[PDB]
Amino acid sequence: VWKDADTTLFCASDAKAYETEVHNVWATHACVPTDPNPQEIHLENVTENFNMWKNNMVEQMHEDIISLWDQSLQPCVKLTGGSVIKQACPKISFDPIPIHYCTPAGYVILKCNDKNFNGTGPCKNVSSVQCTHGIKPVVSTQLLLNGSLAEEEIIIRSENLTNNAKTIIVHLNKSVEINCTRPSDIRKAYCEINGTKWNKVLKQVTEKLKEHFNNKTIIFQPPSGGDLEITMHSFNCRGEFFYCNTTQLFNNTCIKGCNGTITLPCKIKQIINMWQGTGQAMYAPPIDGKINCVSNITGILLTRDGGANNTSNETFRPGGGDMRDNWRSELYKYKVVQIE
Numbered sequence: 605v606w607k608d609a610d611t612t613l614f615c616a617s618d619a620k621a622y623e624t625e626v627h628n629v630w631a632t633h634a635c636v637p638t639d640p641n642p643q644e645i646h647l648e649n650v651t652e653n654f655n656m657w658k659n660n661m662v663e664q665m666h667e668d669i670i671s672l673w674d675q676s677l678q679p680c681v682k683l684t685g686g687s688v689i690k691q692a693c694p695k696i697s698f699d700p701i702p703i704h705y706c707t708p709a710g711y712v713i714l715k716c717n718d719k720n721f722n723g724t725g726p727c728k729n730v731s732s733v734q735c736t737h738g739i740k741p742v743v744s745t746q747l748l749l750n751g752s753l754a755e756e757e758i759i760i761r762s763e764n765l766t767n768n769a770k771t772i773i774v775h776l777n778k779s780v781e782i783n784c785t786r787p788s789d790i791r792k793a794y795c796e797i798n799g800t801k802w803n804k805v806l807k808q809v810t811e812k813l814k815e816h817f818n819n820k821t822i823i824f825q826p827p828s829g830g831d832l833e834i835t836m837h838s839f840n841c842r843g844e845f846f847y848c849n850t851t852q853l854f855n856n857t858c859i860k861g862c863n864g865t866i867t868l869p870c871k872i873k874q875i876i877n878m879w880q881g882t883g884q885a886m887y888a889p890p891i892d893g894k895i896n897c898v899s900n901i902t903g904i905l906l907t908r909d910g911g912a913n914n915t916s917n918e919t920f921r922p923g924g925g926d927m928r929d930n931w932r933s934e935l936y937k938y939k940v941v942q943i944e
């Protein structure tokens with residue numbers, strides 16, 4: 605027997621002590637080695653209540669990633685709280701590794717295995733683990749990259765679909781590659797996506813949200829203003845902060861002649877708004893050479909337009925900005941409990 609509890613977790617990794625890649629360096633001194641022989645214990649005929657939108661593993665991971673980024677990235681200047689802070693800005697090696705989150709003695713992690721679990725409510729196929737699976741801490745908006753996939757149907761996760769200010773996490777069951785390159789203006793870049801695979805998946809997503817919104821017409825529109833970090837698909841590739849225009853991916857016409865390669869325009873930005881919320885940071889100009897990152901789109905973050913309770917349409921725009929939802933999309937099936 606066990607009871608819902610909140611304890612400070614520890615982390616584990618297969619990080620290499622000789623690497624200079626910042627994720628390895630941070631995990632080498634802040635996490636322990638992953639258990640070589642992990643044991644997973646299935647709990648026969650037991651049912652447990654999960655709630656992904658009220659999970660303290662979320663905020664613990666958020667804390668870890670903030671600390672990771674603050675020890676790893678070296679901006680030449682940070683304008684924070686009215687306070688300029690200058691320091692050397694060497695280029696770094698950057699490629700996220702999976703991090704495992706683990707319970708201390710006297711606690712354990714309950715794992716939801718219901719394939720179609722949406723993130724809240726009862727789960728009937730429950731297991732017990734000491735650590736979660738290896739989660740890559742990918743920092744991005746609009747598109748969730750390099751995560752895990754939904755096992756059966758595409759899942760729609762939200763704390764309250766009725767409230768349109770609550771973000772909608774869409775868990776894909778089929779990854780779609782995004783291939784972003786700054787070839788050898790040095791900040792010019794672009795991302796290539798297979799149109800036929802994206803639009804097929806995009807159309808499957810519309811039918812799933814049709815299921816949740818009373819078979820209403822689902823419409824995609826690009827962000828309605830805001831900072832470039834959420835108006836564009838922002839992510840970090842090999843240390844460089846990429847901003848990509850995704851209006852070509854949320855086009856309701858193709859859900860005809862759009863079957864080849866979609867090419868998103870991208871820019872590498874030196875001056876950015878921190879996702880930690882601490883203000884602005886300036887980095888050095890990009891490195892020479894082919895900057896390339898091939899990633900899997902495994903989810904989409906959407907925010908639905910409000911005020912359409914009188915009309916026949918529901919309109920959605922790529923959302924994000926709160927990185928907790930990024931960690932939320934991977935920690936949704938885990939919950940901490942105390943042994944009794």
Ligand SMILES: *[C@@H]1O[C@H](CO)[C@@H](O)[C@H](O)[C@H]1NC(C)=O
Binds near residue numbers: 717729
């Ligand atoms: C419960 O989940 C496990 C692991 O995901 C999988 O074998 C199957 O879906 C379920 N197994 C049983 C015995 O219910």
Ligand SMILES: *[C@@H]1O[C@H](CO)[C@@H](O)[C@H](O)[C@H]1NC(C)=O
Binds near residue numbers: 725760
């Ligand atoms: C998730 O499932 C629960 C039932 O356990 C339900 O109350 C809730 O509305 C569902 N949420 C979504 C987004 O489907």
Ligand SMILES: *[C@@H]1O[C@H](CO)[C@@H](O)[C@H](O)[C@H]1NC(C)=O
Binds near residue numbers: 898
């Ligand atoms: C991309 O997705 C495929 C499965 O769809 C997976 O096998 C592959 O390892 C993924 N690549 C990365 C970098 O996660």
Ligand SMILES: *[C@@H]1O[C@H](CO)[C@@H](O)[C@H](O)[C@H]1NC(C)=O
Binds near residue numbers: 778
């Ligand atoms: C993904 O889920 C949709 C339903 O949401 C289903 O129609 C489709 O066949 C699934 N695709 C795969 C590859 O599982």
Ligand SMILES: *[C@@H]1O[C@H](CO)[C@@H](O)[C@H](O)[C@H]1NC(C)=O
Binds near residue numbers: 764766767768
């Ligand atoms: C969901 O959101 C609607 C509209 O914002 C609100 O009326 C309702 O109280 C919310 N439901 C829950 C369970 O929070």
Ligand SMILES: *[C@@H]1O[C@H](CO)[C@@H](O)[C@H](O)[C@H]1NC(C)=O
Binds near residue numbers: 783784785796898
């Ligand atoms: C990614 O794009 C570059 C240039 O567009 C190309 O050279 C490379 O082969 C592509 N990689 C994949 C895996 O599609």
Ligand SMILES: *[C@@H]1O[C@H](CO)[C@@H](O)[C@H](O)[C@H]1NC(C)=O
Binds near residue numbers: 864
């Ligand atoms: C797009 O993916 C489809 C499979 O859905 C495949 O027929 C084709 O090879 C791909 N085309 C491009 C340009 O990537």
Ligand SMILES: *[C@@H]1O[C@H](CO)[C@@H](O)[C@H](O)[C@H]1NC(C)=O
Binds near residue numbers: 815818819
């Ligand atoms: C939503 O649409 C499908 C159309 O096939 C239907 O089966 C389902 O019952 C509909 N639900 C409502 C509430 O209209």
Ligand SMILES: *[C@@H]1O[C@H](CO)[C@@H](O)[C@H](O)[C@H]1NC(C)=O
Binds near residue numbers: 835836849850851852
């Ligand atoms: C994205 O590109 C479209 C044209 O395809 C343009 O109208 C729009 O202004 C761009 N987005 C931003 C945030 O500049």
Ligand SMILES: *[C@@H]1O[C@H](CO)[C@@H](O)[C@H](O)[C@H]1NC(C)=O
Binds near residue numbers: 742839841896897899
């Ligand atoms: C996703 O994983 C691939 C393979 O590990 C890596 O090359 C790529 O940089 C990753 N994408 C991001 C945004 O970290």
